Amino acid sequence: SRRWFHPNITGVEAENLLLTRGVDGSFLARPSKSNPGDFTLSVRRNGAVTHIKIQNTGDYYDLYGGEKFATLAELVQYYMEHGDVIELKYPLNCADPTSERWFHGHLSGKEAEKLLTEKGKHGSFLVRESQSHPGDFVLSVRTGDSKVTHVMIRCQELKYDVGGGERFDSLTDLVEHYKKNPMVETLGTVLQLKQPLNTTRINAAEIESRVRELSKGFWEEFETLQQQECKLLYSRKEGQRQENKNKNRYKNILPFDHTRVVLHDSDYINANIIMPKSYIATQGCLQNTVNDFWRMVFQENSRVIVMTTKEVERGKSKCVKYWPDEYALKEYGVMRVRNVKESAAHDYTLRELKLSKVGQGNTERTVWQYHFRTWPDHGVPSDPGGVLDFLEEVHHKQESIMDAGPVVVHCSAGIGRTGTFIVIDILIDIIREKGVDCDIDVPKTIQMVRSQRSGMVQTEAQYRFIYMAVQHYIETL
């Protein structure tokens, strides 16, 4: 559901809501007003409201006095199923419809009809503020293969209704009810609420116009996408096994069982297959996971590794050195690696590595390691040029290699900068194959990658970087 997230609420409003409408164990999560980019977990315990900081600079959701999580929905689920104790028992539900995909706010019946004509199909819908009745709403549906129907939504004592029957405490409750139990028109027409009207899918050539519309917008679009993360709470059982605990960099940032990379000749690595050319999104190696990392690269026939972290950042180990020094030969378990040559560029270093299995002459292949070294400690690069140029080179290397396996992409936890690189690369690959005249949907593409690994793309800063990267790529064409 993800109803416990309140997007437009202050700390005082949150305390008031938990005191007057909540009980002990009641909680909500919201964006931090005193430091944008951060979040606050507001909890009621023994008659009083406490506020707990969640930070995210781009790698994970770091909860004060708690753990590091891939998403807020994953954090909430962990504490619900599990300096004294704070109990998360009861979500305080938000009635605000702003982050709902179908909510459009200020829109006319003429304009809603135009948008439903252009992008709509049978069962496409939206909810907008009423023109004639200020404070009321309008549900606009498309039916057929075709027509558009407008259903008036009355707001009477902050409860919503369609003229009769049930009175709902929020537009969400009304939308959910009439989605399960569709309204039938007198003459037979079933007003099916199949899917919300798409607004994010744009033609590639027109990216500059949307970036301008969102630069006035980016925050609202991202948060609508974040609201959809509750649909991606897939099982991560293999990652929770006792034998696999110390193979994870962050205890609760785990690979989905259905997409994890299974090792066949144990079977565990914290990595997932990303299918849009495919990728392996993984974490930075631990001392005890270097061998399994090389077994993964060898088994998957990967010929290209993208590393988007320094070994050490802010005096903390982000990835152990899994490759030999230049000209040196090392043995990592059954795997053998030679670092043939290192090439230094402005933003990155290329390492030409020869990988083979010990005792097997013929299994040798070149593995090209692209190590981006200039990504800032916090946030995203100011300009996308460097990232795009690095990515163009990586794409060309992979393209030149006959039957190359997935491209391996890693940072620290392997969800933020990793998620960001993979998404930019997916969107650009669409534009190089189709041209300026093609459709691109940034939130749709992210949602698709997020169903394959938790919290792929962590922040609004990264979200805006993906848009700026795409815009830059289209501009230099």
Ligand X SMILES: Nc1nc2ccc(Sc3cccc(Cl)c3Cl)nc2[nH]1
In this complex, which beta carbon is closest to ligand X, that of residue 411 or of residue 466? Answer: 466
Please identify which residue in 24, 441, 451, 471 interacts with ligand X, judged by CB under 6 A.
Answer: 441
Find the part of the chain contacting ligand X (CB under 6 A) among 80-88, 217-225, 293-301, 402-410.
217-225
- Tokens 């039916």 identify what position? 143
Give the interface size with ligand X as a residue count (CB under 6 A): 12
Work out how close the CB of 136 gets to ligand X at its nearest, in angstroms, rounded to a whole number.
20
Nearest alpha carbon to residue 380 among 283, 476, 469: 469
In this complex, which beta carbon is closest to ligand X, that of residue 216 or of residue 396? Answer: 216
Q: Flag whether 412 is marked binding.
A: yes
In this complex, which beta carbon is closest to ligand X, that of residue 42 or of residue 454? Answer: 454
Work out how close the CB of 200 gets to ligand X at its nearest, in angstroms, rounded to a whole number.
5
Work out how close the CB of 193 gets to ligand X at its nearest, in angstroms, rounded to a whole number.
15
- Tokens 């495919």 identify what position? 278
Work out how close the CB of 169 gets to ligand X at its nearest, in angstroms, rounded to a whole number.
23
Work out how close the CB of 128 gets to ligand X at its nearest, in angstroms, rounded to a whole number.
11
Work out how close the CB of 308 gets to ligand X at its nearest, in angstroms, rounded to a whole number.
25
Q: What is the pairing mode between strands 90-91 and 68-69?
A: unpaired
Find the part of the chain contacting ligand X (CB under 6 A) among 221-229, 351-359, 382-390, 407-415.
221-229
Find the part of the chain contacting ligand X (CB under 6 A) among 26-34, 325-333, 351-359, 439-447.
439-447
Please identify which residue in 42, 56, 124, 224 interacts with ligand X, judged by CB under 6 A.
Answer: 224
What whole-number distance in Å separates Cα of residue 28 and Cα of residue 93?
8
Spot the catalytic one: 94, 155, 411, 438: 411
Q: Flag whether 416 is marked binding.
A: yes
Work out how close the CB of 429 gets to ligand X at its nearest, in angstroms, rounded to a whole number.
18
In this complex, which beta carbon is closest to ligand X, that of residue 149 or of residue 199? Answer: 199
Work out how close the CB of 26 gets to ligand X at its nearest, in angstroms, rounded to a whole number.
28
**In this structure, what token pair is assigned to residue 426?**
């997916």
Binding of ligand X at residue 221 (CB under 6 A)?
yes
**135-174 positions binding ligand X, by CB under 6 A:** none
**172-211 positions binding ligand X, by CB under 6 A:** 198-200
Q: What is the pairing mode between strands 90-91 and 26-31?
A: parallel
**89-108 positions binding ligand X, by CB under 6 A:** 101
In this complex, which beta carbon is closest to ligand X, that of residue 93 or of residue 200? Answer: 200
Q: Flag whether 303 is marked binding.
A: no
Catalogue the E-assigned strands of 345-453.
348-357, 365-372, 407-410, 439-440
DSSP sequence for 114-164: HHHHHT--TTEEEEEE-SSSBTBEEEEEEE---EEEEEEEEESSS-EESSS
Q: Flag whether 377 is marked binding.
A: yes
**Residue 407 buriedness (CB in 10 A; 0-12 / 13-18 / 19+):** buried
**How many Cβ atoms are within 10 Å of 257's Cβ, its own excluded?**
15
One character per residue 268-297, x = contact with ligand X (rule: CB under 6 A): ------------------------------
What whole-number distance in Å separates Cα of residue 332 and Cα of residue 289?
10
**In this structure, what token pair is assigned to residue 195?**
């899917």
- Tokens 């929905």 identify what position? 73
Residue 411 among the catalytic residues: yes
In this complex, which beta carbon is closest to ligand X, that of residue 77 or of residue 447? Answer: 447
DSSP sequence for 268-308: --SEEEE----EEEEPPPPGGGHHHHHHHHHHHT--EEEE-
**Residue 120 buriedness (CB in 10 A; 0-12 / 13-18 / 19+):** buried
Please, after which residues is the chain broken with C–N above 2.5 Å?
A: 82, 145, 216, 265, 276
- R_g (Cα) of the chain, nearest Å: 25
One character per residue 40-79, x = contact with ligand X (rule: CB under 6 A): ----------------------------------------
Cβ atoms of residues 371 and 307 within 8 Å? yes
What whole-number distance in Å separates Cα of residue 15 and Cα of residue 146?
48
In this complex, which beta carbon is closest to ligand X, that of residue 304 or of residue 449? Answer: 449
Cβ atoms of residues 306 and 372 within 8 Å? yes
**Residue 190 buriedness (CB in 10 A; 0-12 / 13-18 / 19+):** exposed
In this complex, which beta carbon is closest to ligand X, that of residue 102 or of residue 368? Answer: 102
Please identify which residue in 225, 428, 468, 474 interacts with ligand X, judged by CB under 6 A.
Answer: 225
Q: Flag whether 411 is marked binding.
A: yes
Q: 79 by DSSP, 3-state: which?
A: helix
Residue ranges of the annotated binding site are: 377, 411-417, 458
**What residues line the site for ligand X (CB under 6 A)?**
101, 198-200, 221, 224-225, 228, 441, 443-444, 447
Residue ranges of the annotated binding site for substrate are: 377, 411-417, 458
Catalytic residues: 411
